[PDB]
Write a protein that binds this ligand. Sequence first.
Ligand SMILES: O=C(Nc1ccc([N+](=O)[O-])cc1)N1CCS[C@@H](c2ccccc2)C1
Ligand SMILES: O=C(Nc1ccc([N+](=O)[O-])cc1)N1CCS[C@@H](c2ccccc2)C1
Lengths: 546, 546
Amino acid sequence: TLRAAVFDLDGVLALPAVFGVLGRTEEALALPRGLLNDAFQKGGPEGATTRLMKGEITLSQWIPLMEENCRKCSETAKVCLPKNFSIKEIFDKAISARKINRPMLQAALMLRKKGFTTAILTNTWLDDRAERDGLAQLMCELKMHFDFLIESCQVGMVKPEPQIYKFLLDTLKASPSEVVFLDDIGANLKPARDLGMVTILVQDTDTALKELEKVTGIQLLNTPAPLPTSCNPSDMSHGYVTVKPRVRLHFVELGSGPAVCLCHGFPESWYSWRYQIPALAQAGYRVLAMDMKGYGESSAPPEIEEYCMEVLCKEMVTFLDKLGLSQAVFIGHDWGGMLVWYMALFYPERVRAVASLNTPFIPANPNMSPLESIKANPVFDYQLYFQEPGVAEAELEQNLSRTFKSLFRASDESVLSMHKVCEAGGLFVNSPEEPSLSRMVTEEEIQFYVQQFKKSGFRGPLNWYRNMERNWKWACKSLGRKILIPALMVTAEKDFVLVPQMSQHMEDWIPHLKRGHIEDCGHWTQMDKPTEVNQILIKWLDSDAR
Amino acid sequence: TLRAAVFDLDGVLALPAVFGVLGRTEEALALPRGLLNDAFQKGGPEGATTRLMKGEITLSQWIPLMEENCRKCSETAKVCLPKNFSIKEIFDKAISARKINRPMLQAALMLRKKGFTTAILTNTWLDDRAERDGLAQLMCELKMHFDFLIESCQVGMVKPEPQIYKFLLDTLKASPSEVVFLDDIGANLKPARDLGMVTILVQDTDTALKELEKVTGIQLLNTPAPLPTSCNPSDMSHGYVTVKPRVRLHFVELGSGPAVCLCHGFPESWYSWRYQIPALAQAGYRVLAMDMKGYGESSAPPEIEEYCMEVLCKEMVTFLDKLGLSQAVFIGHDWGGMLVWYMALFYPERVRAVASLNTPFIPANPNMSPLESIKANPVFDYQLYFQEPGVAEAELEQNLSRTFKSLFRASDESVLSMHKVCEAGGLFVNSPEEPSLSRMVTEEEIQFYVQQFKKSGFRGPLNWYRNMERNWKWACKSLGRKILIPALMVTAEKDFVLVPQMSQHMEDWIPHLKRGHIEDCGHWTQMDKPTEVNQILIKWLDSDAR
Ligand SMILES: O=C(Nc1ccc([N+](=O)[O-])cc1)N1CCS[C@@H](c2ccccc2)C1
Ligand SMILES: O=C(Nc1ccc([N+](=O)[O-])cc1)N1CCS[C@@H](c2ccccc2)C1
């Protein structure tokens, strides 16, 4: 019974095969057929290429040796190489053109999801070229999805030598009959077959995957669109900044490029951005996913006033100061969306661009108390329930698993009524003791929220709702301003608390506002429709946020 | 008696004054004298500029109002404004030209060092221009050196209104007679003087500083070159990455731009880079200053083999993987310098560029055991003392303060002999019990090292020396390679362990190697000559590392 799948890199996990460029070059330059591929393999086990693949020499030292072999071959073939012939240019272009074979990666991802151990086994080189970063980025993107990456230049062994296959089996801790090995080189497949491994010669991806699903008994072809890559909390870089004596802010950090600060809502976590963090970093951004004040590993002081928008925003500015960031693009959802509009209004010099999921920008009404404004909307009744210190804390803290399972539900999963919460006497009074698991979350993801909230509970989080008057007075100071930095408003069709129509007048205060809209999407935007959130954010980031 | 110094921004801490550009523009465009400065102040307390400075409107909303005022003024003066007249262009250029007044900043730094509370009090605006980052960067660089930054647009008050001065005194927690207030605007100085503050009208910096030193009794002019900005450990962003089940790596992170990974030596800390971290971040880099494996907040497993170069390097690659960095420039000192050359040799695709302080690159001799090679050099005797587990640990751990005070000494401060350490029976056998404090360190800096080493002691650190044979065998695999990525070798004249002459053959293996050399500099390069280390590293980074 199979339990391990091994993939080659060139011609299997990445296409077009860097190998196939020698053939393409011969054709484009009208050189004798196989001349370049012959110079490439010259000397066989004792030649320059084997030394390169074993890690004896680097790619830059190999380049002149390949050029000498090309000349020796051309002399024998009684031909002339072009005037401007460059092995470096040929390989720079070939490596740059080589991209991940997405259906092959999806298959390896599915096999690993079904309990297989997966590995990449590759004949590769030590790349010291000026443009080596492109390949580094490729290898980084691919390697994260596999249990092991075995590189010939690192192990000092090369396919087809039998030792590399015994090394593979030893790292896999598996007998050969338990292993599928996929390669585009028939000669490199032979030693695996000779040991009794199931082997697949890869020409076109589709046939290789039909052979692979026939042999594993797992559907890999024509399968539904998979979810974006999520985060394993223990595999992340965890950052901590003290913003004032009793307050520290925690964040998860991934990637390089312009800083993108992700601000979650109520009652959430940095982990609410789990499907966005890997995608935004892959898109060329440095992601800083916060635990907002009152949450997870960030400090949660008890005082109500520690949670007014003026102080929360001041602390986020201090957070940038301490990290040495002059700006960040700010992306918020829910209460984090409210903070992000206030960051744009009060600190435009620190905000590269601003985006909000669900939360619209609505200016303070100076002729009405915020209580009156909240009371006018029947959907906002739950906010009055949140006012009295200790009441919502007791109910939300009574059974953590029940709390998250009841809150975190898709629009079709009997959401939770938000009207007559005060009349009813609580949020979960008409809710089951043991709610069913929403399709948006796994049991393990729920238990991450339970564990996070065990530290500080709901006092700090509920305090974000307890500064209505304080926030209203501060917001009134900004009534003559306009938001003129790049801005994105993303609406969610089925969010019945933060309804798309509530955002209809935003243009009056943000004239150049850009929009996104997600249909069949409830309040929990990020986990409800992760693929579409990612597409809308990356498109806006690359156009408007550098 | 004075105890607080307050500085204006424009014309005082930053020059040329953005104000003075209206005059310059009038002259360059042959417009009536004061026409632009008159349109700028139009309406006085009720005009567009006051609304801007109070934060009622942003800089982008103000721009058309200033243009209307310019036209109204020109109509009255019976003149025409040019065809291509643009307030935006004028202000973009003026703000971009405005730089920190370094001697004024040095004076504020000296006053704060002598116990003064310092503040910036400024009439400024909410900057939402596309080029707002330049000013954001300026404000960031300046604000870090002060106790308070009071901005008119944030407090909704403006100089010369008396309320802003009462607000200043309340934030300073000081009576007016205790405050020096420096401003380039005579009208903005009057309310401070009226309250009884010592005031200084700033025209030329030199006269202002003579007035300032006369009044405080502190030398601020013609003073020696100050040290670069250091780090306060509690003010930094602290990062943590798990690289494998029992191993986590700690780092301090500051700035934005290409990732620069700082690797300390023995027996050191991330804090050994304290004078480099702020300077490199200011220079446009993202600094990651490590606690190397075995040190500070990083894990310190007991096994010798956990500290061989192959594993240390593999873990540093995993560290980049987990942070989502395809590359970093690697800068090492001492044992960190050795690791960084090995990162370049084994993982060139992950190393943007490589620099070493003191540690040369010397290839492994395959015809001699590493023990023999170490025994050949009399200065390397202390390494034989470090071999036997527990022996050097007991001596180095006996009195932590004595350990660091004995080790950390400048070339002229009776360093410590490194020959006949085994014969002598220890490192400190001819050393005093209570060593004097080196001029390189303060008592507080010593106590930071003491506190860090209290966690794991010297077992993990000494284990870096205990893998001679293991490192020699691994290094021999790289004997046919050359280092062809950008490389910097920095030599220290008076390092008598890592002598400059030991680096003389490096070109044979690193043909394009660049060099730096520091005269009158001992082993502790970073703290011995911080200004020169900073100059050499920033120059090489901007030329060779993007
Ligand atoms: O209550 C909110 N969202 C929310 C989040 C979670 C739940 N929940 O039930 O889990 C309910 C509501 N909001 C956060 C974004 S704006 C905020 C708001 C503040 C002032 C006025 C109107 C609306 C309301
Ligand atoms: O011992 C070293 N430095 C050092 C650091 C601190 C002290 N000290 O006394 O504090 C003494 C020596 N070295 C680290 C850089 S290369 C290393 C080395 C390894 C192998 C062969 C020769 C030299 C020696």
